[PDB]
Design a protein around this nucleic acid. Structure first.
Length: 178
RNA sequence: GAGUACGACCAUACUUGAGUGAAAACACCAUAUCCCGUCCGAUUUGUGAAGUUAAGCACUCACAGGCUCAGUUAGUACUGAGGUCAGUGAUGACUCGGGAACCCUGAGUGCCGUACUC
């Protein structure tokens, strides 16, 4: 659906102080809806790993990362999430999508359904397209068969929003009402 | 480079145990006629100058105790603002900010002022 998350590369740094005349510059990959969320997830991680605040803070860069050619790949979205009971569970969750930013979006849609975890209770680590022979689960590995050939059964062919109707004529493509 | 008298901050100066100490000064020390005060010339007061750095004082030395100062603990605990957040609830996370403490580890262990003197 051209996914709802974007791959931001937020580069930042503490500040030129007089204690620290030249501070360390940090790189950070984040999947965010926009860059305002993406800068704040960066300063969340500068606080909980480096004791750096955003007040004493520089964002040197926050730019999107363009995707790739659209090719069906296998992605290991090594992902972690917080629940109140059994906090900070980390899973691996191999997926099957055309892009890297869409693979993380699928991870956010089934960390939400299988486990009921929301955006801010999820951290995403090391998204990489892996080959076919490294896929471990057979529910993703079944698509590497070179001769798949399934039928589209049990469909919901709806009309095209310009010719939809309410009462059609039972064996006929008419429209008695609408 | 030190002494003595008055000192300011009042342990980075304290406590314990060793070591060393030029000069000069402090100090133990000698003493009881007067001044004076005691159960007691012990303290205290007077008057001294034979003796000694033994002790005080000073300095130096401890995988010393303490103290002082950073660091770690730790963006942890906690907390200001927010939600028709999650959870039966207890409570928890998130969001915008602030942000500890002991343990532990490293360092070093008085500093400045006036007058007189070696």
């Amino acid at each position: 659906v051209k996914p709802h998350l974007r791959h931001y590369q937020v580069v930042g740094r503490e500040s030129p102080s007089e204690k620290n005349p030249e501070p360390t510059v940090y790189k950070f990959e984040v999947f965010a809806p926009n860059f305002v969320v993406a800068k704040s997830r960066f300063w969340r991680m500068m606080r909980v790993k480096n004791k750096v605040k955003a007040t004493h803070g520089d964002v040197l860069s926050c730019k999107v990362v363009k995707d790739a050619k659209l090719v069906a790949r296998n992605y290991l979205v090594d992902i972690a999430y917080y629940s109140q009971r059994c906090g900070y569970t980390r899973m691996v969750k191999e997926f099957r999508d055309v892009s890297k930013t869409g693979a993380v979006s699928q991870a956010y849609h089934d960390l939400a359904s299988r486990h009921r975890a929301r955006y801010h209770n999820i951290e995403v680590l090391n998204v990489k397209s892996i080959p076919d022979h490294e896929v471990k689960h057979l529910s993703i590995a079944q698509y590497h068969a070179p001769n798949l050939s399934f039928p589209l059964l049990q469909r919901r062919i709806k009309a095209a929003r310009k010719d939809r109707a309410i009462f059609v004529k039972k064996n006929t493509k008419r429209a008695v009402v609408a």
